[PDB]
């Protein structure tokens with residue numbers, strides 16, 4: 001019964017963000033700035049309907065979805081790719097597959113304790129982020 005991810009979440013760790021960005025072909029100059037940043041994530045969730053806003057001083061990225069409903073996603077101001085995205089529940093873990101030109105691209109997001117965990121995958125690279133609730 002930990003599917004409720006509502007809140008404002010502040011990043012406390014960001015492991016292998018460098019490798020994940022390189023797997024997405026982010027250029028070096030962009031990576032050099034992006035790797036330093038503390039991200040904030042605001043999740044507005046009504047059951048299976050999610051509105052998410054991820055913010056930083058350098059980039060912001062918003063995505064809304066309903067669990068179980070495939071949608072077109074354009075990762076504007078990140079890697080700027082078009083994918084078909086589907087978010088599902090595996091237990092109380094939110095799982096996203098982003099089908100497109102990059103193999104094995106997706107993410108998983110879940111609550112444990114008072115922390116939000118987010119694992120981002122692209123190819124053979126996994127980035128592990130942890131956020132603390134504000």
Ligand SMILES: CCCCC/C=C\C/C=C\C/C=C\C/C=C\CCCCOC(CO)CO
Pocket residue numbers: 021024026030034035037039041052054055056058059060061062063077078079107109118120
């Ligand atoms: C926006 C703040 C970015 C700062 C770095 C700026 C530029 C790096 C370019 C590309 C990095 C690719 C991706 C960025 C990582 C996570 C974004 C959010 C993706 C996961 O969020 C999901 C909902 O959306 C689940 O919560």
